[PDB]
């Protein structure tokens, strides 16, 4: 690849009419297509010394007896701008020569317009290593030979910013560093494979509902590049025993081919792909990936933002895209502060079989610094079939028992699970999760329009406080029945809008919604009050109410106090048809509980079309302590004389024994 | 045009102080700013032969008596690999010159550098047919001019993965076939137009809504390219009687231009538009179509993913973009199994005048192979004005196909309209649908956040069973009351939460919800119970209920036995202000029904500010069957004695008649 | 500061064995790889003069005594159109030198081959200005250098369709006009800013709260382009007291670096960015703005879709991306019609502290014609922390001067802002607005799934009448009490839903909801009767109801008429616990109000487990008008006889005084 010729240096100037050097010749260098004898048309001429300094010298340069440019009798190297007009005069004023444009004398005059007519790019097929192709690049790069690599190849992009375009395969095990790539790049169409074929478990059925026994997981274990992920540390908690049953070789594998962009600003990655691959941005500011298409995951998170080293990061996004498999969280954010701008977050993501989370905003002190995420935005994202919380949006789940937290506010300032992360959550969906579905804890944010369904574990494990929720929909969750209820919540919340009651009714404890420390309104379903625990259930906005009782022979409305009893109401109100169905008449029974039994005390209105309201009486003599409301009479009986009598408390307040009726 | 200048390629070396050649001298070139005599500082030197042989030579280059470098008696051209320091020694051994930094680029062999330095792309202005450009392409292909085609351009890309950029027409009627494309190819900006102006109808009124006649339908026929679409087989079944009226060339119209892709992996098409154009992938897997520039539809469907032959459809997406018009379904998917990964379907879309559907998986068997689809997701899709079903997500029709459906769950395992589709539906939107804006059949789907407003056609035809349904918001559908049912589910699903009724539409007052077979909850709106027909309308997860009355002098809470009467209530609780309002005094009546008339039988408390309990009695002598509660007395009047008697059912079970009151 | 060396361009030809020039020698120029001494192989040779003129010359080129080519004595420069082989002979005919390929390739074939092979593009560095580059462009225009422009400079394109991969910075002060772009032209990676930094006001502090005092606003005055915004005319009205605190320099200037396109069709601008940016689109159809790179804004509109010049606009979208600080409304819309496609949309946009609004429409006549906007779409778009209204989708408009519109329809004919336009709205959000979360007027609109949440200003302020809204949520807005309410409708609308109160409603101060003529329905939350004030609220579509208590000794099914009282009771069914809590027995009282105080008159059932309905009686003589129902009786107390008597109305309807209870 020799490109530079060993030409004669220190150029020789020769007379135009004899083979003689122009001794004491005058040279003028000036603007293109201008006369350089006039001083206003001249351009600077610099000498270049032993140490690289460029020093401007006077314009008429002296040609000596040999034909070369001397400054003070000593040879020099004169250097000027690319285009100039040169004029050589002899010592007697005769014009030796006049070149109007030196650049128009190069042998290849097609090179100029050929350079300024086409578009620059370089192909990997013509170069041995990727460093040579990266160095030779100016505008774009083309990957068309499948490149083998290992763990440790760094390639520098010289500060120049390009449009990387990839159209082939990358193979090899290890990490490939992209460094010093400028503001505003594009990297499109990456593919990422590995050499060896690791062992991945198969923890779901042929009918795709989850399989929970560790022995069958070990039975379905096979070496492949798809249809499974290698087990992780959290799967050991998820699957007990599976640590011992699995043979030791498939434990703690680190077979990862990954591409890491090391502290680059504003690099966009488009349509990322590659099975069991890894893609991570380290310290990247305003760098996002844009509709990555179905890459299978390995050990490293397929979408990773790692901002731990150096300054806090901001602007990292995951726009659209869909990712498949992955032993850890597919999209893991690390130490991102969105600022008042509300930067950072995910858009339109689809996740599938993420080892931990479709998105993991990392929680607590991770490594030597914090890992929390602030002011991020999450909307229109879907997680299907994960192992843990598809939107794990909490920052202080279990860790940091100490009152302080490194590089962050202490617990003494803001308490555990109760933090101003201030994320933006909307329109998110979880389906088919094995473990918990949505985990999130903080203070002062507002979450809305969650949809979690068909969850083997508890579809909602919320642990926040002072957080308002609207149009939430956790339906058909906890279906394997790990937990006694669908949704756990620790601190206080104020839900405005929810729906419950699914195809598989919960039977773990006969308790659907358990927020006894929290205030919930808008609960939808025929679910019994004994299966509900709240701190406040007051749908205090309802207007004119009418009750439909479809499929029940009597119309039922229940008024319940849970201080007295749970499964039993303080009072019930039924309407029953007076006679056979279609009678056109129906008496109204209003009953209350007495002696741990409902329907023991009841009043009847128009009992079998009697045009009268029933008035009960005390089976014994009415006691003075039984009735204490003045100006009222309590009826009672005397079986000895077989007649009604009244214990009358006058409006004055005294007790009189009058005779209601005589035989 | 000047293209190559005559110059001498042989360099000439001369003395420093005289005009004489360096006779039999030596030249050492080495690293920048180093003495080149040491072998450690020496850089390689290559003889560049007349063909480009590049044969390496030893370091001290020998100069001739003419000042030119020689090797084996012949003149040579020496090329090196980088900038060098030159040291020129006279034959005696004296330093002619030393220069620390010199670099002059080789002015020849530019063809090699051009092939290594630019981006390859072929243009149609340089080739007569598309197949020539296909054969000549290696990296890109630019449609710069307007291409005619016939039905059946078979074009082969030979397996090279390309990016087919487009900047002009694809005009013609029929099909264009792109064959043998590598994984990851791209098409962008392709736009087509049929050569012949077709006969299109105007099945809508320019001041909103559709046409429901036959006279004006034929009166609005025009030959155009926009503002109208082609009649189909199933337009006469929506506009009764056109079949004997249209032009014969209009019926069975072939006027369509299509983009047909056959058996290739991972080929995306971007921002494709077209007048009377449709894009049909045939047997293609892992392909998508990122947005669109509003193509105008033709006879065939606009977006058509078809996979009957060979394996099923997988990874087959529609992301973004809007479409206009079309005789058949806008987005159709045939025989697509998304696998366990659930890869396939629409993520965001916008449809107008979607002649058969915004999205439709064709149902049953076509040809000799079933057309059923598996794991198809549908998010963020907005359709407006579909002539037919808004999203035909079903897989089985009403007419019974061959029993034991091949390649599916057989009719012995799973009956008609009873299939697990395992689909995901969320954030839908409908406006102006003359068709049934949503319709699907299956077993155990989980539909969420559909929303259907302002449709001349029926709101919903849901033919699944025991599924999950959520927040259907039916808003003035059936403006002029075509059919009876707006929302109708044929199974035992749970439609948790809904909303009905816009300004005025039920069917004409007369039973929207024809769903007496599903356990529904969360319903709200301005829909009458006589118009509600559900299996079990019980929202019993409620709490302390508030009843705020606006526009009512009274306050009402009703509980109804509908089988007694659809329009009449069984019982009620009313708060009625005695005399005039503003008193601060309103009495409470607990009321039943007797003889199909409300407010005939009741108990009243503070009635007309009486401070007591108003209770009626039997007008004539009460019988022993009207009172059926022990330890309770029913009052009644005796007109013969003009007094009160009381039938007192004792707790012992006996009845005694006592004079309740007599002066 | 210099790149090329000062070399002698003129060729000198010397002998190959001795240092003597080829005196009076011959140069023969022929075809590639042949013997040029044959006249048949000889190619044309041309003298190239200084000024560029060519003169075809006879072939045997004379070399004079100085070794330079001369024709008429004077030195010349010989050039050929194609590659050549050269043979240099001495005066005696001995061949001095032969070369068979001067450039080792022939550029005359290779020009055609490279024209056919490579991709076309011009660069900005090769040309001084942008107009000459645009005239010389064919397909692509790479902007590889920062370009200094000035306001109002116009660059034409001649109608060529090009992609402009805007690649470096692009700076200047004012508007830059682009014209004459064909369909499919694309701009990508562009970046605006200007030289002069403005005076910017910073009315927000760390506490996530805004500064409302004018001196507090002026005390945050910076010289910057980001983290602030330029004061305008509207901030005079918005900020009371700001009209005199600012210095004279800080108001009245207009800085906006805008890339404005003029009378173009189908031009997309991808991945736009820029500090203090601006993008004005004029006379545009089918255009888009695909994504964005959060361009901070300037004085003028930052996405200003205008169609003033020509006809009405059609199809101008903003897809995805995001945006940041600005001085006026983020998206303007001027004079665009949607036809029937509802064309003109903003989708997935997350604007942020726009100076006035994230999206808004204009009104009146501005410039040269009217400036209204009908039939647009706004889906999934989000504006967080604006200053004025969150979305101004107000197309029927609220012009404070005379209501009739110029060149349009009246308002005295068309009720307070009436025009059926049917803009589509779904999944919109506002947070932290100082204006309002929603503003739009229309008849027949259908608006769904809005979640306005946590704004300093009011939740909404409508201007519609007869338009339907569904799943509406407003949460915890209006902390400063910007309006007198949180949600307002200024007409007769139907609001199918409202989910209120997260933590606060005003300061708890009254008038939470306003609807003087509008019917609302289906509301749920902690809202109270004193907070609700609508025209109507009737929820008749629901089913069976249950009263549930938690931590209370009471269960209250409570009916209140607001004609009677706001906080007092009109009637209720209370249920309390007999004796101590947890006894298993509970009593129930049907209570009414007597004397503007609750529980003054009631019936008590199971009072102290007596199983009896307590009957209060009139303490005085029961008057004739106290009881009026036939076949009834009213008890009363006689103090003179201290006895319980009864006024009995016979079933015929006549009164009689009898003795109820007396010993």
PDB file of N, CA, C and O in Angstrom, chain A residues 263 283 285 306-313 335 369:
ATOM      1  N   UNK A 263     -17.486   6.413  26.504  1.00  0.00           N
ATOM      2  CA  UNK A 263     -17.645   7.872  26.640  1.00  0.00           C
ATOM      3  C   UNK A 263     -17.732   8.599  25.297  1.00  0.00           C
ATOM      4  O   UNK A 263     -16.931   9.475  24.970  1.00  0.00           O
ATOM      5  N   UNK A 283     -21.021   5.989  29.901  1.00  0.00           N
ATOM      6  CA  UNK A 283     -20.849   7.421  30.056  1.00  0.00           C
ATOM      7  C   UNK A 283     -21.400   8.230  28.901  1.00  0.00           C
ATOM      8  O   UNK A 283     -20.991   9.372  28.682  1.00  0.00           O
ATOM      9  N   UNK A 285     -23.789  10.474  26.668  1.00  0.00           N
ATOM     10  CA  UNK A 285     -24.735  11.561  26.868  1.00  0.00           C
ATOM     11  C   UNK A 285     -25.498  11.812  25.578  1.00  0.00           C
ATOM     12  O   UNK A 285     -24.894  11.992  24.517  1.00  0.00           O
ATOM     13  N   UNK A 306     -24.528   2.586  31.217  1.00  0.00           N
ATOM     14  CA  UNK A 306     -23.717   2.548  32.436  1.00  0.00           C
ATOM     15  C   UNK A 306     -23.068   3.913  32.618  1.00  0.00           C
ATOM     16  O   UNK A 306     -22.119   4.260  31.914  1.00  0.00           O
ATOM     17  N   UNK A 307     -23.581   4.687  33.567  1.00  0.00           N
ATOM     18  CA  UNK A 307     -23.129   6.051  33.790  1.00  0.00           C
ATOM     19  C   UNK A 307     -22.337   6.203  35.083  1.00  0.00           C
ATOM     20  O   UNK A 307     -22.151   7.333  35.547  1.00  0.00           O
ATOM     21  N   UNK A 308     -21.876   5.098  35.679  1.00  0.00           N
ATOM     22  CA  UNK A 308     -21.295   5.152  37.020  1.00  0.00           C
ATOM     23  C   UNK A 308     -20.007   5.962  37.049  1.00  0.00           C
ATOM     24  O   UNK A 308     -19.807   6.792  37.943  1.00  0.00           O
ATOM     25  N   UNK A 309     -19.125   5.743  36.085  1.00  0.00           N
ATOM     26  CA  UNK A 309     -17.865   6.462  36.107  1.00  0.00           C
ATOM     27  C   UNK A 309     -18.052   7.882  35.583  1.00  0.00           C
ATOM     28  O   UNK A 309     -18.886   8.149  34.714  1.00  0.00           O
ATOM     29  N   UNK A 310     -17.259   8.800  36.129  1.00  0.00           N
ATOM     30  CA  UNK A 310     -17.287  10.182  35.690  1.00  0.00           C
ATOM     31  C   UNK A 310     -18.570  10.900  36.069  1.00  0.00           C
ATOM     32  O   UNK A 310     -19.250  10.566  37.045  1.00  0.00           O
ATOM     33  N   UNK A 311     -18.908  11.904  35.266  1.00  0.00           N
ATOM     34  CA  UNK A 311     -20.043  12.781  35.502  1.00  0.00           C
ATOM     35  C   UNK A 311     -21.353  12.008  35.321  1.00  0.00           C
ATOM     36  O   UNK A 311     -21.396  10.949  34.690  1.00  0.00           O
ATOM     37  N   UNK A 312     -22.423  12.539  35.920  1.00  0.00           N
ATOM     38  CA  UNK A 312     -23.754  11.982  35.709  1.00  0.00           C
ATOM     39  C   UNK A 312     -24.142  12.106  34.242  1.00  0.00           C
ATOM     40  O   UNK A 312     -23.830  13.100  33.583  1.00  0.00           O
ATOM     41  N   UNK A 313     -24.835  11.092  33.733  1.00  0.00           N
ATOM     42  CA  UNK A 313     -25.254  11.100  32.350  1.00  0.00           C
ATOM     43  C   UNK A 313     -26.690  11.556  32.165  1.00  0.00           C
ATOM     44  O   UNK A 313     -27.494  11.546  33.095  1.00  0.00           O
ATOM     45  N   UNK A 335     -27.547   4.947  36.896  1.00  0.00           N
ATOM     46  CA  UNK A 335     -27.134   6.281  37.357  1.00  0.00           C
ATOM     47  C   UNK A 335     -27.448   7.366  36.322  1.00  0.00           C
ATOM     48  O   UNK A 335     -26.565   8.077  35.842  1.00  0.00           O
ATOM     49  N   UNK A 369     -20.740   3.606  43.708  1.00  0.00           N
ATOM     50  CA  UNK A 369     -21.579   4.795  43.695  1.00  0.00           C
ATOM     51  C   UNK A 369     -23.039   4.360  43.630  1.00  0.00           C
ATOM     52  O   UNK A 369     -23.363   3.177  43.770  1.00  0.00           O
TER      53      UNK A 369
END
